[PDB]
Amino acid sequence: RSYQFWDTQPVPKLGEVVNTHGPVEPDKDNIRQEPYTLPQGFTWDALDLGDRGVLKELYTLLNENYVEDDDNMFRFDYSPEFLLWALRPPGWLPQWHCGVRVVSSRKLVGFISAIPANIHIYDTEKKMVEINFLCVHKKLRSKRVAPVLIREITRRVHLEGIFQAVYTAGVVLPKPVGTCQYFHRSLNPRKLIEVKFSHLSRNMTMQRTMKLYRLPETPKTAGLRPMETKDIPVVHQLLTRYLKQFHLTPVMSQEEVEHWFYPQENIIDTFVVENANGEVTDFLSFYTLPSTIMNHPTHKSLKAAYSFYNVHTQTPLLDLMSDALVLAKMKGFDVFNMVDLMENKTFVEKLKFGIGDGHLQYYLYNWKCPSMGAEKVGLVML
Amino acid sequence: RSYQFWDTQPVPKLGEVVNTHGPVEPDKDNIRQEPYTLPQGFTWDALDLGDRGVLKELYTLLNENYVEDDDNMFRFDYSPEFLLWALRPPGWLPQWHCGVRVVSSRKLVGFISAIPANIHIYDTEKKMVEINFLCVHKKLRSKRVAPVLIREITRRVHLEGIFQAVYTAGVVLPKPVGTCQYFHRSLNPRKLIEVKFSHLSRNMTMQRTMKLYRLPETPKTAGLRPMETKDIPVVHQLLTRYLKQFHLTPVMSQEEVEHWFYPQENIIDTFVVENANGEVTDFLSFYTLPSTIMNHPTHKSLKAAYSFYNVHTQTPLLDLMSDALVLAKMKGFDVFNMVDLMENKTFVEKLKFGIGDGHLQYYLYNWKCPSMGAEKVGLVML
Amino acid sequence: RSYQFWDTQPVPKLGEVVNTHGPVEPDKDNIRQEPYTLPQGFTWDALDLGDRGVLKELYTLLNENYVEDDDNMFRFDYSPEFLLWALRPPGWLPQWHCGVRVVSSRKLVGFISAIPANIHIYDTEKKMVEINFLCVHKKLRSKRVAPVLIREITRRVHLEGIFQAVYTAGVVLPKPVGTCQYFHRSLNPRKLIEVKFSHLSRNMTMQRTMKLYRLPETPKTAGLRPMETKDIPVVHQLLTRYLKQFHLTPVMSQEEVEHWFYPQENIIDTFVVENANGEVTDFLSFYTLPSTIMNHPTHKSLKAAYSFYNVHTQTPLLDLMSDALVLAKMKGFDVFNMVDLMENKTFVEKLKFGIGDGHLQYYLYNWKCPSMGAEKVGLVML
Amino acid sequence: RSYQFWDTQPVPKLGEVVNTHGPVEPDKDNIRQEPYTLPQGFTWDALDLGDRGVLKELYTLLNENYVEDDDNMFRFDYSPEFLLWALRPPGWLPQWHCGVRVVSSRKLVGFISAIPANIHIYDTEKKMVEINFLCVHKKLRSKRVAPVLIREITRRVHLEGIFQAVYTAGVVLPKPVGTCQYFHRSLNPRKLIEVKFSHLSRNMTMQRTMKLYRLPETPKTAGLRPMETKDIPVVHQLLTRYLKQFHLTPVMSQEEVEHWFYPQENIIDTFVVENANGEVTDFLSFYTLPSTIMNHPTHKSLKAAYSFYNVHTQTPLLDLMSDALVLAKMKGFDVFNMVDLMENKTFVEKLKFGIGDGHLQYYLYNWKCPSMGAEKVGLVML
């Protein structure tokens, strides 16, 4: 395999062994001032997501052209409020909301985004950006617009003095620092069968599988309750200490912990365990991300919840995650999705998670370091 | 001499000679969510400098209560445009424009500011903040208000995940990382004598004193011209490479170079040297800060120029700085002020600079490192 | 949730943390002299309520356009004599009876009122106004006339040197200082069910319902009698001492105590307990505010009594409120209404009150302070 | 000296040096409902000053019995229009115009008045009353009628929830908060000498006297003009900011500013300085109070001007007061009177003011605070 674009980028080559730690190329001290040229009839446009009309344009572009499963049956349906939460964390910059519009009709046909993040990678803590929501309109595919978007966001991030990024993709590029598998836990088995998300278990029937995937009516961990403002410091402390055991992690400020974990309905849910002494010992969190059910006339929305960051110091992780499934069922989700990073593998069997198709690859840009097992990835991206 | 406040802070003790490099205390896992309590009748306020009224409140407070000369006869005249330049560089945050108001009147009586900066100190580059414009109304002096302002800005910076700061002061605190002296160069001698900035020397008549300091009407260096947008990258590259030879320097992004150096009338002046080949090989910069005569506040200002960053690779430093003086005299400045950091000592005598009273002390908060000579200090602060 | 008008006003933002106590903005030392511009065809007019024709006009506007229940079945029917009581307390001003007329037909289509009140809020006592009776004609709804009325009364109150205000609303605005719930006590349960104010309970008959809510035919408390002029000082004394335990209360002069509590038939009823020693140790009070029953051929009005201020020092509060119910029943009221402020929650169950829909939000204008539970609200609005 | 009445009142004793701040006794929560008993044959009557017959009775009482001059050869000549201005400011109450009448004849023989005012005293602002025009018929003197008047107006003010007062007197009572002296400026010195208000000074002629006190015929400050309706906001702003430097001051609403300063001929004169930019930067004001002369060599009345509030921010105070004298002379005044409060002492010498007999003592009722110098008194009483 030959990568026309990625062979020119500061990333390790696919089959290369990596025994060192450090950047691929030195920091630049002079940056290209002019935006990269787009094909004729297209123009750059930084999207003001505070303008609800422009936010709806981005919602529409992603709702119609963003990530689909392998079988092309489901597509992510990021709500506009979710996109606001994901794209305006502390330190966001308007130029890093990088759209492409056709000049004649002003139609949004491309996008890519960067948000700042302090990243712990092995023994180094570096200021980086997280790249997400790279999208090219279906009617512009395979014309190498995606390399222009990547080079442009690189340029605009370089202008701010940042020379490394982290990103995830379902495809293999040079070169994954980690590779993870998807796991799903059924909550509404019938809907998952009728929409062909899962198939009837072999040597089983419909209402056999239902009471097999049944769970309690309310969680079992004593002291569980939704996160409040008074919990921001301890949630920050619990997260920082928990994440030290992994090799690729975010390093969040207390302001970033508030942004990413303070509950917002139909966006992010965080529950803390406050024990008999009044101490917050653990917390669980998951975010709301439905998928559009394509070419299906009856059921059109698949309501999914995604495991976010789950920290345990006193409640066993099995108890914590069981309660997360229970809370997700109570809130009307159809499935609970996660990736096998951190300690997520440890409760797959007992909590009856099923393995999904594909792989999630983790990448660093302009950083060369030995790869790591999925259990050492401690970074969850949206 | 003991420091009731500073002895409690993460800084080296005076007299403690330091040979190590690192933080004094760890980054904080959890941060006080509540602002520190002010004396009764006062409250915090994050000033929105984008509001014309609030901005005028700030320069009123500063022009009436900020730093005066050791003589107590010259109040600096801070303009709103200058304050937006100094207080809103890339990365500025509203919560870091920390004001103190009387609760009932909302009268502004205190201020302290933080701006983010990437700082290189010996072998380590770290994101810090620069603390400036600490000001307490003259009717509230000597009543412990300054330690509360310092702790509150410390708290607000901690909340963003930053645990180091750099600051300067004319007073000795635990513990200076560097000590610098002030130097001034008369441009318009007769006005400085009339105002009593400089007095009549021994056997020195003023019929010939306009001779001692007179300068060419035009600069010697051929390719000298004002900095333009097209120069932003090369000025960024020149500055970054020049600063590597010092031990305490900023690390500016290209966006930060544009903000700090792109010329703004009566604020910041930058001239690049473009040689016979079209290459920019040097540049000089100075910022504008006039002073009102405390005895004659209704009279016109004392126009002062302050040396900023001067980089040479092809023009001799002596030539660049001489042209700096000539350009300042051309623009109507009465005096050119500088601090003996970087290589500024090398042209003091030849260019007829005179020493000033007092010392400029440089400090790091929560970073223990050996002290350095003025000539290794490569950071200029407003 | 974005408020086009309220986000411009000196009130805290919804969901903001409030640590402080004080004004949002300073007292204004120059006030807009010109009334705010109304839509074409409409004019301001200060209503002289001492003129019976104009009083009738305001009565008509409110009787047809003021507050309805959330099912549009009942509308407040403030009497003219009630309106004089509520709008001409000590210190009233004619410019604060602010109406809007149609220029051609002189028809009253809008109103808003201010009355002065000294307000105790936490550890501060401020001269404020109470804003009430904001009303826009049904045919003029949703045309942004309310923001003009609010800004104009704000201007007219500013002219008299008052810069804080207290008000209640059934809708959620930025930002409630307290939230309370409505409770009712059936007195004529047959009529209440016949007009669908109440519904028949769980498998219970009409005959069982009527005797569940039966009341004694005379009050129980020994010494209960209507308030007389001689009681004004002790009622003033009882109220002042009792209100000290709450966090938001009025501070009434003795002249204000006479206005608000001296009995006026069909307006305000106050009963004191004069014990066997001849001293007044308690008092209860309720005002008369019926509701129009919309589109009913037989029942035209819902005669309702509203709990006002009830002070107990020797008679148990439970006993006082029971006699309030008995007295209201004797007087022919259909229902006894209250808000769960002060200690009202303590007798909801014992005395068989039933919960109402919606909430009553309490707001302060240009005053930032922590919110409070309903039991610390000690201020009753008309 | 024993003060039979004042020793019973909540005021500091003379010789008691006070250096705390606050009320002498707490607010009362029950107030005497019945008027105090007068000597047999006398009754209380609240004077309706909107009745021209009753207004005529009051100025008859005052013109014949109120404050005599320092030579008791003149009588003040209070017009009905002056008294309306002094006694009906914003917030006036009819019960605070407190008269005493003979029962059988209804003859008015006593008076005392309260008007409301917000008062800034050191670091406290409080709603107070100003007491003035205490007058007892000459044939009723020394019968202790004045203490009953004072107790009765205290009671009527307590009934409205106000527990502090400010007042002035020529006599020493417990306990002056500040002491000022009277100054006067001859404008028509020949008339003053002929009516024995002045005596021709040491060894001079009338010609030399009239030359000594001669004034320009037109004011020096160009842009001086009468106050107009459009100036009400800026005059309010100027006054509020200027008065902050003094320790005892009124806090006027914009409505109060209009009442006290808007010109009424033969009552109050206000002139503003509108500079070359159209900005109003200063104002001067004086009120009219003539004195009838009890003798005629010719000359029935003495036209006296009294300095009111003079605010300077651009015009030097010397020039502003010089222009006030010129304006008073132009309008036919014979003398310009003032008290050495605020900055008035600073132009006594240059503008040729002379000292008058007696002193003006300032008092607070039920408020303890340190005394102040005359130049810190910022309150002018009629």
Ligand SMILES: CCCCCCCCCCCCCC(=O)SCCNC(=O)CCNC(=O)[C@H](O)C(C)(C)COP(=O)(O)OP(=O)(O)OC[C@H]1O[C@@H](n2cnc3c(N)ncnc32)[C@H](O)[C@@H]1OP(=O)(O)O
């Ligand atoms: C210091 C600052 C650095 C900041 C930048 C750091 C790097 C950030 C990198 C981006 C992180 C994104 C993180 C996320 O958002 S991952 C989510 C990506 N979005 C989707 O999957 C949505 C649906 N798909 C599309 O909209 C388009 O098909 C996309 C835009 C994916 C490709 O458009 P198109 O189908 O029209 O293709 P092309 O002809 O234009 O281009 C073909 C070239 O593109 C390489 N390609 C294909 N898919 C990806 C992919 N997901 N990451 C990186 N490269 C990808 C491919 O190997 C080939 O290069 P090479 O084989 O010739 O070498």
Ligand SMILES: CCCCCCCCCCCCCC(=O)SCCNC(=O)CCNC(=O)[C@H](O)C(C)(C)COP(=O)(O)OP(=O)(O)OC[C@H]1O[C@@H](n2cnc3c(N)ncnc32)[C@H](O)[C@@H]1OP(=O)(O)O
């Ligand atoms: C990780 C985030 C960290 C962020 C914070 C990093 C540290 C930032 C540190 C501040 C960087 C400022 C950078 C600039 O802007 S330097 C310019 C400072 N401003 C002026 O000189 C303006 C005119 N002066 C004033 O307004 C007042 O005199 C000030 C406000 C300076 C002091 O008010 P006042 O005279 O009423 O005093 P106090 O009774 O309240 O307090 C006495 C205590 O204050 C300590 N003091 C006096 N002057 C300074 C000074 N320049 N830096 C640090 N500390 C100072 C003093 O040693 C004593 O502590 P200790 O002797 O008892 O121990």
Ligand SMILES: CCCCCCCCCCCCCC(=O)SCCNC(=O)CCNC(=O)[C@H](O)C(C)(C)COP(=O)(O)OP(=O)(O)OC[C@H]1O[C@@H](n2cnc3c(N)ncnc32)[C@H](O)[C@@H]1OP(=O)(O)O
């Ligand atoms: C220093 C002195 C300050 C003095 C002023 C202190 C503040 C006084 C504040 C008033 C205290 C009143 C105390 C009482 O009397 S509460 C009783 C209010 N009256 C009624 O409920 C009677 C029936 N309703 C009506 O007549 C109208 O629907 C009213 C007049 C309520 C609104 O007219 P309309 O339906 O045609 O709407 P619009 O298109 O003109 O305007 C919509 C805007 O108005 C905001 N809105 C809606 N309802 C209220 C409400 N009850 N308080 C404050 N704001 C309210 C709304 O959020 C939106 O603003 P934003 O969402 O764009 O931000």
Ligand SMILES: CCCCCCCCCCCCCC(=O)SCCNC(=O)CCNC(=O)[C@H](O)C(C)(C)COP(=O)(O)OP(=O)(O)OC[C@H]1O[C@@H](n2cnc3c(N)ncnc32)[C@H](O)[C@@H]1OP(=O)(O)O
């Ligand atoms: C919270 C609400 C509080 C409101 C009230 C605040 C207090 C307001 C207080 C009033 C502020 C007034 C502000 C102005 O208007 S000052 C202008 C006063 N008026 C005149 O000078 C007009 C001509 N004089 C008279 O009409 C009478 O001589 C007056 C009425 C002055 C006294 O009548 P008379 O000569 O027949 O005497 P008496 O036997 O009835 O009574 C003798 C008692 O009166 C004490 N005396 C003498 N002169 C004054 C005086 N100017 N303030 C206070 N007390 C005064 C005296 O020390 C003795 O008390 P004590 O030595 O036994 O203790």
Ligand SMILES: [Mg+2]
């Ligand atoms: Mg393409």
Ligand SMILES: [Mg+2]
């Ligand atoms: Mg202080």
Ligand SMILES: [Mg+2]
């Ligand atoms: Mg409307």
Ligand SMILES: [Mg+2]
């Ligand atoms: Mg008497």
